[PDB]
Symmetry: D2
Amino acid sequence: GLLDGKRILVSGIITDSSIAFHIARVAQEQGAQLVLTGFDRLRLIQRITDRLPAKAPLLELDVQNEEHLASLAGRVTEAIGAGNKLDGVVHSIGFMPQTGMGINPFFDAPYADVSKGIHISAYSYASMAKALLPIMNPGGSIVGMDFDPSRAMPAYNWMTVAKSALESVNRFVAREAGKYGVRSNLVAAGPIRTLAMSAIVGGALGEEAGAQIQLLEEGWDQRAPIGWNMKDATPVAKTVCALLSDWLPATTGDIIYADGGAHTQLL
Amino acid sequence: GLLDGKRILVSGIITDSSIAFHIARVAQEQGAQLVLTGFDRLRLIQRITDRLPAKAPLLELDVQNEEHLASLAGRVTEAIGAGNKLDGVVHSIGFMPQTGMGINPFFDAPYADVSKGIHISAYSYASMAKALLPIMNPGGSIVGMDFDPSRAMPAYNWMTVAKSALESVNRFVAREAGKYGVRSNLVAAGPIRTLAMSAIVGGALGEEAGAQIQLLEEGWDQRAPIGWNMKDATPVAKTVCALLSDWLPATTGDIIYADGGAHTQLL
Amino acid sequence: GLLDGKRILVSGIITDSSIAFHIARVAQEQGAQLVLTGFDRLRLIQRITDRLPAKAPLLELDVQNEEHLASLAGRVTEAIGAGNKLDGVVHSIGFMPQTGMGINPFFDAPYADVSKGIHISAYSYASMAKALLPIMNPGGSIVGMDFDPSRAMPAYNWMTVAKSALESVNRFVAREAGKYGVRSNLVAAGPIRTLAMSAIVGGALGEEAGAQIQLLEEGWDQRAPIGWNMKDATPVAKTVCALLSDWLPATTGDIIYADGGAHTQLL
Amino acid sequence: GLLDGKRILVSGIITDSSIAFHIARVAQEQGAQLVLTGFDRLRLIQRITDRLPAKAPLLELDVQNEEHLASLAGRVTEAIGAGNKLDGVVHSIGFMPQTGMGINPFFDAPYADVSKGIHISAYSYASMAKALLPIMNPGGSIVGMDFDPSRAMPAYNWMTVAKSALESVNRFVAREAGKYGVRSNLVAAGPIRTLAMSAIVGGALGEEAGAQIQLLEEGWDQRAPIGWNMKDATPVAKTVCALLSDWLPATTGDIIYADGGAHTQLL
Ligand SMILES: NC(=O)C1=CN([C@@H]2O[C@H](COP(=O)(O)OP(=O)(O)OC[C@H]3O[C@@H](n4cnc5c(N)ncnc54)[C@H](O)[C@@H]3O)[C@@H](O)[C@H]2O)C=CC1
Ligand SMILES: NC(=O)C1=CN([C@@H]2O[C@H](COP(=O)(O)OP(=O)(O)OC[C@H]3O[C@@H](n4cnc5c(N)ncnc54)[C@H](O)[C@@H]3O)[C@@H](O)[C@H]2O)C=CC1
Ligand SMILES: NC(=O)C1=CN([C@@H]2O[C@H](COP(=O)(O)OP(=O)(O)OC[C@H]3O[C@@H](n4cnc5c(N)ncnc54)[C@H](O)[C@@H]3O)[C@@H](O)[C@H]2O)C=CC1
Ligand SMILES: NC(=O)C1=CN([C@@H]2O[C@H](COP(=O)(O)OP(=O)(O)OC[C@H]3O[C@@H](n4cnc5c(N)ncnc54)[C@H](O)[C@@H]3O)[C@@H](O)[C@H]2O)C=CC1
């Protein structure tokens, strides 16, 4: 298995359509031993993760909670056993208040909302690395989830800004992680029909936002030389596993695009 | 003159070595009528700006102050006269708390500090555009100051992250500004020996941070095919004026590099 | 005038819808004294350039002709007067054989064709700089015309490759030009309905190629936050003049996007 | 094994310090069945490849030889057996005449030399894909070797231009390869001390070129958050294997940086 014997923390499972659910599933299929972290609805997440091919301890982690972070590494050490360290960390956490997205005018997002979004979506990549690098093995890998923010787009608004911040954070995290013999990288995924995405497409953030995202999705598959299946998170999970593996050992502070190649094509 | 008859708001003068001081001076040399905005030390800024080739009304603008922003356009209209609108807006505002920079470990910057930095340095580009676009003429130009954050670097830490955010914000601001027939662009300047920069070089944020920035500056001039004079903000002021002019009329959501060409060269 | 007193060589006029025709016209409107170079059909080009606001000596330059290049600087010196040097050079030259474009399969372009295309479209940027830098003044500016090749696109095929090469060449030209106190930059223009473009849209390189380019043009204006008018080369001519001016004095080895901001927007 | 059962053509072995030698070795260690191609010195290459963990048919391929390419797929089919197709293709071919590199002035490289360099180094990526895609399986992977040309650098001169062309070609190859369910990607490696590199460092292309490359190598390891060992091609071979695998299944027309993360860091 690709991740045989590796111990890997996977954050960001909330439903069985979470990208992190698929990351966790593929990692397990590939021999990894997981510790999961979950935000807020731990009973729900436990029930969801019961469906993973293997049992995995689930730890509460609200990335905005200083104490959760301060206790994180001890709790993980408790879960994987004293003397054992993590080989991988998957950050699959993102949030932006509604005012920072969709048809709420870009200018109308109050900074408190944007800040909370950037906190959860960007800064927490650094928070997590800070918490976990002390308990990571040399040759370890931190992976976060990105959505290519190099160009502006409708609807994603301040979440795109948050991702721009995240990409910058990742480069700094790589500098820190390198001290530990650890890589830090993002996977920039194509659009995936998670519950939230489906809700946006269905107009939850305004009809025009829904229409634009639908157009975005369609254009993505069109541009993607190998196509893009927004209903299938597996290619993205595999890519995350690729980075968690020993097979990209010279790649760090970097972004791997698991988007069907859409970003390399204009039309 | 390049900016003859144009009315332009210039934020960010704090000392006579502020990049915005030079932007204001060059703009005036080029025929622009200025409104200045200043943060906090208005008496100081007035005295500094007395040295500009022309008188310019100075308005208080704390970009974190909602009321300042809410009143901004009325105050500007008051200053330039009812029925007159702005042709240009220069955002030359940046701040990051000390914990977000220098030898304070990257991981040790508390999010409240980072957030304040991103507020002033990134989000305020959107705040300013929100406040001023209603009083900007078609063919207008918003320009913000950038420091190329595409690669991580020592010492600049969360300010680089803030600039990554700013670049993303600028692309969204362009979408909004385009509705007004207004361009929005950043000038990514090479390093300029402002007071703060000199202080960092002198070790104000730690000796190693100072040493790294010094190396950064030296490498910049070396890489720059036309050299880079960190003691001369004029080439950057001119570039900002170029964007404020009618001479880059098809450029928006974009970044103009006024850095000696350093970013185009590896070594 | 923006280019008052500057002496500027403008290559690439072939018809009155040549981007270089508009560059030459705007430069003249802005006070520049021009020397034109023309390829092959000098009688035609003379007649076309008779329409420029001012007379300009026209010199033959086949960029693939070593002797033309070897004699170029002497001929220019002859035209502008001994003791006078150029302040600006505009490279607005591009060609790719039909096999390298349109619906001719990408794989089917014979290398001899591609090579000729890269010769005229990329290498000649270096050839021209080699020929002219000895007769350029400090503070001079070389500008070439680019079409953003960072992402692949239908129909443009090997011309996109040629532009990728050109952008790389420009960065090297900047290193050389910097020795002379000369900047070297590209303007990446949006699509302009030159005769050739109109012919491609009309199906000259295959119906599907025509259909794709039409879609490309439509998407460009849609994405452009300030719109894009493919029938108007003036915004691009102005941008070239901006780079020929003293107003981007710290920009070199670089690309200025005169494309309505289209490249900064995904959708 | 990562590449278990996959049939993969590996071009570009010339010595046991060829990056392709290490790609071939790692691929074999990972279960791949190889067909090798070799240029010119087939007796030498056979003797070199005798050292690979497994036997592999060696086929002559001069990428500038139309007949070699025209016969290539039949010869490969002969070697792997009728009814069997390739799963992977590794392009590890590069050449630039001396005049296009080192201290030979950039402007002094005759186009015939540059063209030959671009032919072998860029166009041949398309030639190889053209030859081999008809005999590649869905889910296949074409990988070429890149050296990040996004910024100009000393000494590499027209080879950097060739790599810029190659990166553009790769994006087009992805469009074609996608029709076959095949990915096309580049690995941008850090500098590797191949024989040629060592010769350049030793001054084979001029002392200043040697000095600059040495500085380049040193800076690379310094910038690389996880360091860079130019004497070790394994991390790059592994990265190529990662792309040949099923583990980056949504990545195409893309560049994977196996450079220690050096390109993500300024200083
Ligand atoms: N769905 C899509 O189209 C794409 C999503 N992404 C990114 O993938 C990552 C995963 O999101 P998805 O799986 O799409 O959605 P999701 O909603 O399944 O996952 C987001 C996760 O973030 C967690 N989260 C929110 N606030 C948190 C906090 N304070 N502390 C800890 N965790 C918190 C949520 O509990 C949830 O598990 C995010 O970074 C997202 O931006 C990237 C590209 C595309
Ligand atoms: N000095 C350098 O090397 C470079 C600086 N820059 C950027 O140029 C811009 C101008 O900075 P400099 O002239 O270098 O330094 P500066 O310190 O002269 O200017 C920064 C300005 O930001 C203003 N500011 C801070 N907080 C504010 C708030 N809450 N509201 C309104 N204004 C506030 C300050 O009053 C000051 O006028 C900044 O965006 C900076 O990041 C960009 C590239 C290089
Ligand atoms: N039309 C468009 O949509 C865009 C064009 N460009 C570029 O702008 C530049 C100008 O082209 P356009 O004005 O569009 O077309 P054009 O056909 O008016 O100009 C191309 C010029 O290249 C010259 N040329 C061709 N072979 C030559 C040789 N061996 N020696 C000297 N000159 C030679 C032609 O004589 C012609 O004057 C080209 O680099 C083109 O790629 C860039 C972006 C968009
Ligand atoms: N050594 C380095 O620092 C780096 C090299 N690369 C690239 O890696 C690839 C492999 O080169 P290296 O292993 O470094 O050197 P190498 O000299 O071992 O390999 C180059 C190969 O190109 C082949 N070649 C040359 N002309 C050919 C033709 N007409 N037909 C077929 N093959 C031909 C040579 O026979 C040789 O096998 C090249 O694309 C090179 O640019 C990329 C990054 C760094």
